[PDB]
Design an enzyme around this catalytic site. Structure first.
Site, PDB file in Angstrom:
ATOM      1  N   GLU A 117      79.903  37.682  -1.897  1.00  0.00           N
ATOM      2  CA  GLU A 117      78.453  37.945  -1.866  1.00  0.00           C
ATOM      3  C   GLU A 117      77.934  38.065  -3.312  1.00  0.00           C
ATOM      4  OE1 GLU A 117      77.064  41.336   0.396  1.00  0.00           O
ATOM      5  OE2 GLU A 117      74.960  40.668   0.176  1.00  0.00           O
ATOM      6  N   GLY A 257      80.086  48.371  -5.491  1.00  0.00           N
ATOM      7  CA  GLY A 257      80.638  49.516  -4.818  1.00  0.00           C
ATOM      8  C   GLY A 257      81.677  49.098  -3.794  1.00  0.00           C
ATOM      9  N   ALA A 258      81.232  48.371  -2.797  1.00  0.00           N
ATOM     10  CA  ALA A 258      82.139  47.897  -1.762  1.00  0.00           C
ATOM     11  C   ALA A 258      81.498  46.775  -0.981  1.00  0.00           C
ATOM     12  CB  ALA A 258      82.555  49.030  -0.831  1.00  0.00           C
ATOM     13  N   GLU A 260      81.362  44.432   2.785  1.00  0.00           N
ATOM     14  CA  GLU A 260      81.511  44.465   4.290  1.00  0.00           C
ATOM     15  C   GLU A 260      82.187  43.217   4.919  1.00  0.00           C
ATOM     16  OE1 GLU A 260      78.563  44.294   2.606  1.00  0.00           O
ATOM     17  OE2 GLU A 260      77.161  42.970   3.696  1.00  0.00           O
ATOM     18  N   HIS A 293      78.665  53.046   5.111  1.00  0.00           N
ATOM     19  CA  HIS A 293      77.771  51.914   4.798  1.00  0.00           C
ATOM     20  C   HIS A 293      78.401  50.598   5.160  1.00  0.00           C
ATOM     21  CE1 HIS A 293      74.484  49.979   2.449  1.00  0.00           C
ATOM     22  NE2 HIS A 293      75.419  49.075   2.237  1.00  0.00           N
ATOM     23  N   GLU A 294      79.575  50.308   4.610  1.00  0.00           N
ATOM     24  CA  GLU A 294      80.236  49.021   4.893  1.00  0.00           C
ATOM     25  C   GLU A 294      80.568  48.848   6.366  1.00  0.00           C
ATOM     26  OE1 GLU A 294      79.573  47.304   2.423  1.00  0.00           O
ATOM     27  OE2 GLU A 294      79.458  48.804   0.851  1.00  0.00           O
ATOM     28  N   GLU A 316      70.326  45.318   3.816  1.00  0.00           N
ATOM     29  CA  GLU A 316      70.618  46.432   2.870  1.00  0.00           C
ATOM     30  C   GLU A 316      69.755  47.659   3.124  1.00  0.00           C
ATOM     31  OE1 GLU A 316      73.353  46.673   1.529  1.00  0.00           O
ATOM     32  OE2 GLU A 316      73.975  44.524   1.459  1.00  0.00           O
TER      33      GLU A 316
HETATM   34  C1  LIG Z   1      77.100  42.409  -3.666  1.00  0.00           C
HETATM   35  C2  LIG Z   1      77.859  43.217  -2.598  1.00  0.00           C
HETATM   36  C3  LIG Z   1      79.109  43.898  -3.169  1.00  0.00           C
HETATM   37  C4  LIG Z   1      76.964  44.331  -1.987  1.00  0.00           C
HETATM   38  C5  LIG Z   1      77.406  44.836  -0.620  1.00  0.00           C
HETATM   39  N1  LIG Z   1      76.997  43.877   0.458  1.00  0.00           N
HETATM   40  C6  LIG Z   1      76.784  46.177  -0.317  1.00  0.00           C
HETATM   41  O1  LIG Z   1      76.785  46.564   0.841  1.00  0.00           O
HETATM   42  O2  LIG Z   1      76.294  46.901  -1.218  1.00  0.00           O
HETATM   43 ZN   LIG Z   2      75.191  47.135   1.932  1.00  0.00          ZN
END
Ligand SMILES: CC(C)C[C@H](N)C(=O)O
Ligand SMILES: [Zn+2]
Ligand code: NA
Ligand code: NA
Ligand code: NA
Ligand code: NA
Ligand code: NA
Ligand code: NA
Ligand code: NA
Ligand code: NA
Ligand code: NA
Ligand code: NA
Ligand code: NA
Length: 866
Positions: A117, A257-258, A260, A293-294, A316
């Site tokens: 992403e 951060g992370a 999904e 979140h993820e 988001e």
């Molecule tokens: C660019 C990605 C690492 C962002 C990720 N989809 C998030 O939930 O923040």
């Molecule tokens: Zn996200």
């Protein structure tokens, strides 16, 4: 580099329905074979245009015929003369070890991992790297068995084998069609924490957390948080996990951060690894929120994805909202809301007044990785929360249900989500949609009138949004404006008009309007914009005694905090002006008394108390002003802390001691006590020196957990106590091998008030725990300096700007995404005085002239210099 525009969106000429990938994995040279089943939707003469970046093309076949009708162009493989349906086969090579940008397939220590992403899959093979192309993936990974004993991709294992010469392979299949941004591959040697979750309907899910060897002692909390997230999504949203395995891999090298990726989340290790001696309470709660979140993205993002990247907030904003609700339900809702408000007013408001200002659904983008923003994420979530405020929980959930029923298995738009909410609830959101297309922060002005003859209270409310650099035209928004009216004893006055109740959420939809309330038997004290009901600046001419009254009486904890913030804002502004005139801090006795009352009030939740006793950050202070004087703000913050430490000394100590806890637990009541105790410690540190030094040193040395140890260390640094250098060295000698733990120490060095902080920070570029190759280290030293020490960054000699230029000159080439995050403090130049502005502009022009300027930086620099 050319901008792309939302209004130019068009359905793809071709779709891909299924893709079979094989990776012959090696760090120096990986060979990718990609077999895609394609279908033409557009005209018969339209070529197939595939994205690709830094690929070495080996061959192109169409239905097993080596193809001649193709060409490579910049960023593309353009394939002509195709049948309506065909199998495309591409072979290409890539080089993970050369990938310092950490986009696509890269190395993280000895592991190989991916980040796709937004547009990273095109760095792996030539593809329709756009999120409205959803395909079924099968992935075969072939690698050296000793070096890469675990070979992971999305889904479940369907095949496995061993080859000669020490290689082995595993093939994976994921039944859900996905856009390629949700592809993941990981290869390495890990310790694995394994657990299970059984969904409400009885599906058994294998949970697997992969961590570097020797880190299993730091995995259980993240695993606990995953199971908490799964149970919560079931209870609150009615959503269950949809696959058989849930994998998380913690990697040390990660730009964000992370992520999904379906069934195979890839996390920065900062949001996984915790134990009580290494991680603070705030780290535990961040792990919990990011894990959540993820996980939440599995529905809001994966089962329903984005039609195009301009719709990023669709997933988001919604997923941030969900993470906040998760946190809030499990923990302290007041503390969560307070902290999300602090972010909005202190960090997001600043973006919305900056050259990078954009609506939550952007109209124009050069580099899409630049739009993973506070606006898209946090203001997006406030927009979702506005829907929730307008609809109520039950109707909001009906909307969620309709959204999934219509859009499950597809890529959707922000507008589709809004329509689902509107259709399910019968609440008209036509006007509300403007929150998606308009940038900048609305300013809401409130005047009031109490008429004792008629017992009517009238609110006159006006709104406007100032033009922003991206949009010259602004119109009124549908602003849900929550109120509550207090009588002289602190009781809520029922809202009513012409003999009927009136909803306490006012629909402020015009440039100006009046609201009249009847049967108002006492002149009210209003609580306005309750629980920050819209993401707006509020202008109401509060008396100090209305605010202290709210601090004593308001029914929602948030409003008591907020009233304290409005009281302090007046005196922050006062004292910044005074600082500019060389005058010392001035604070009325009655303002100090309001904070003393909070400290001694036994009925206040300690979580709430702790946040009222946490002064607004220098970032939040800065948004109170048109022109920022960052030295005055930093010095006023310190002087206010010292004043309160003196005036409240005995009370501070008493509360500090009363909240002592011998057992450490990661439990919310305990966290709240500890947050209050450490809020007291911050002031005590700035009190009489000898007592401060002894208190701080003792807490550092006797702490049984990192929250207490760090709070002491941070106080020694902030107050420049005698013990500081010794404690900082002790921490370094104990923890230098542990990058996550050293990040806290790098933050303290970067944010130190000491006069030679820049010299110290520069010296730390050679520290044993620092490396320019690691985004977390960069952030913790360089980023904290630029962004969290604006006093030093904005030193009058211009030295902070020159230092950031040198770092950005490196990072532009090494890791442009990290560069672009780091440039943000320089693009705020128009908020500063003329002489700073000149220096900041000179720094931006130097960067503009870099050889091989990345698109990531180009976008920001050209907006800033306009
Ligand atoms: C660019 C990605 C690492 C962002 C990720 N989809 C998030 O939930 O923040
Ligand atoms: Zn996200
Ligand atoms: Na490279
Ligand atoms: Na497709
Ligand atoms: Na097996
Ligand atoms: Na795709
Ligand atoms: Na709660
Ligand atoms: Na790009
Ligand atoms: Na409508
Ligand atoms: Na008035
Ligand atoms: Na008034
Ligand atoms: Na005001
Ligand atoms: Na180093």
């Amino acid at each position: 580099p050319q901008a792309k525009y939302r209004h130019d969106y068009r359905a793809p000429d071709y779709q891909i329905t299924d893709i079979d990938l094989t990776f012959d994995l090696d760090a120096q040279k990986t060979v990718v074979t990609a077999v895609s089943q394609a279908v033409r939707h557009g005209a018969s003469d339209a070529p197939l245009r595939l994205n690709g970046e830094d690929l070495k093309l080996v061959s192109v076949h169409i239905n097993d015929e080596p193809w001649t009708a193709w060409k490579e162009e910049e960023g593309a493989l353009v394939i002509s003369n195709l049948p309506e349906r065909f199998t495309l086969k591409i072979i290409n090579e890539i080089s993970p070890a050369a990938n310092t940008a950490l986009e696509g397939l890269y190395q993280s220590g000895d592991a190989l991992c991916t980040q796709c992403e937004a547009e990273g899959f095109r760095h792996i093979t030539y593809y329709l790297d756009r999120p409205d192309v959803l395909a079924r993936f099968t992935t075969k990974i072939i690698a050296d068995k000793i070096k890469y004993p675990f070979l992971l991709s999305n889904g479940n294992r369907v095949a496995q084998g061993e080859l000669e010469n020490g290689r082995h392979w595993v093939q994976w299949q994921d039944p859900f069609p996905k856009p390629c941004y949700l592809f993941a591959l990981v290869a390495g040697d890990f310790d694995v924490l394994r657990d299970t979750f059984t969904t409400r309907s009885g599906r058994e899910v294998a949970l697997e957390l992969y961590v570097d060897r020797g880190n299993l002692d730091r995995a259980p909390w993240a695993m606990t948080s995953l199971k908490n997230s799964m149970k919560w999504d079931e209870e609150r949203f009615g959503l269950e996990y949809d696959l058989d395995i849930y994998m998380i891999v913690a990697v040390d090298f990660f730009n964000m951060g992370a992520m999904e990726n379906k069934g195979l989340n890839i996390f920065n290790s900062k949001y996984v690894l915790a134990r009580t001696d290494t991680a603070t309470d705030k780290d535990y709660l961040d792990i919990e929120r990011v894990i959540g979140h993820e996980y939440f993205h599995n529905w809001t993002g994966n089962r329903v994805t984005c039609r195009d990247w301009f719709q990023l907030s669709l997933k988001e904003g919604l997923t941030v909202f969900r993470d906040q609700e998760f946190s809030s339900d499990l923990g302290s809702r007041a503390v969560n809301r307070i902290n999300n408000v602090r972010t909005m007013r202190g960090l997001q408001f600043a973006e919305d007044a900056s050259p990078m200002a954009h609506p939550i659904r952007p109209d124009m983008v050069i580099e899409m990785n630049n739009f993973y923003t506070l606006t898209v994420y946090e203001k997006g979530a406030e927009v979702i929360r506005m829907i929730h405020t307008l609809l109520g929980e039950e109707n909001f959930q009906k909307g969620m249900q309709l959204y999934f029923e219509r859009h499950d298995g597809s890529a959707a738009t922000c507008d589709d989500f809004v329509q689902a909410m509107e259709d399910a609830s019968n609440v008209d959101l036509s006007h509300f949609r403007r929150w998606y297309s308009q940038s900048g922060t609305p300013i809401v002005t409130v005047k009031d009138d109490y008429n004792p003859e008629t017992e009517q209270y009238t609110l006159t409310i006006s709104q406007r949004t100032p033009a922003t650099p991206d949009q010259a035209e602004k119109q009124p928004l549908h602003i849900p404006f929550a109120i509550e009216l207090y009588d002289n004893e602190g009781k809520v006055i029922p809202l009513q008009k012409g003999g009927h109740p009136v909803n306490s959420v006012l629909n402020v939809t015009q440039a100006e309007q009046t609201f009249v309330f009847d049967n108002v038997y006492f002149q009210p004290v209003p609580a306005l914009l309750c629980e920050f009901s819209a993401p707006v600046k509020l202008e109401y001419k509060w008396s100090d005694q209305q605010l202290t009254f709210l601090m004593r009486h308001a029914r929602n904890d948030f409003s008591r905090w907020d009233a304290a913030q409005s009281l302090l804002a007046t005196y922050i502004k006062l004292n910044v002006a005074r600082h500019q005139q060389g005058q010392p801090l001035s604070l009325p006795v009655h303002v100090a008394d309001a904070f003393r009352a909070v400290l001694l009030d036994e009925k206040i939740d300690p979580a709430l108390a702790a946040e009222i006793l946490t002064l607004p950050s220098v970032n939040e202070m800065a948004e109170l002003f048109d022109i920022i004087d960052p030295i005055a703000i930093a010095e006023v913050r310190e002087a206010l802390t010292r004043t309160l430490a003196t005036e409240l000394a005995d009370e501070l100590l008493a509360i500090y001691n009363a909240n002592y806890q011998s057992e450490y637990r990661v439990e919310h009541e305990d966290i709240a006590k500890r947050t209050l105790r450490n809020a007291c410690l911050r002031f005590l540190a700035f009190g009489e020196t000898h007592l401060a030094d002894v208190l701080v040193s003792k807490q550092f040395h006797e702490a049984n957990n990192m929250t207490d140890a760090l709070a002491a260390l941070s106080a020694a640094v902030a107050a420049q106590l005698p013990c500081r250098d010794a404690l900082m060295q002790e921490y370094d000698d104990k923890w230098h091998q542990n990058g996550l733990v050293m990040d806290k120490w790098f933050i303290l060095q970067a944010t130190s008030p000491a006069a030679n902080v820049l010299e110290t920070v520069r010296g730390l570029l050679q520290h044993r725990s620092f490396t320019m190759s690691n985004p977390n280290r960069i952030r913790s030293l360089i980023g904290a300096f630029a962004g969290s020490n604006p006093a030093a960054f904005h030193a009058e000699d211009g030295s902070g700007y020159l230092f950031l230029v040198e770092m950005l000159t490196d990072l532009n080439s090494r890791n442009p995404q990290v560069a672009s995050r780091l440039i943000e403090p320089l693009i705020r130049l128009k908020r500063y005085d003329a002489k700073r502005q000149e220096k900041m502009r000179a720094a931006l022009e130097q960067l503009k002239g870099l050889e091989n300027l990345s698109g990531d930086l180009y976008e920001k620099i050209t907006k800033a210099l306009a």
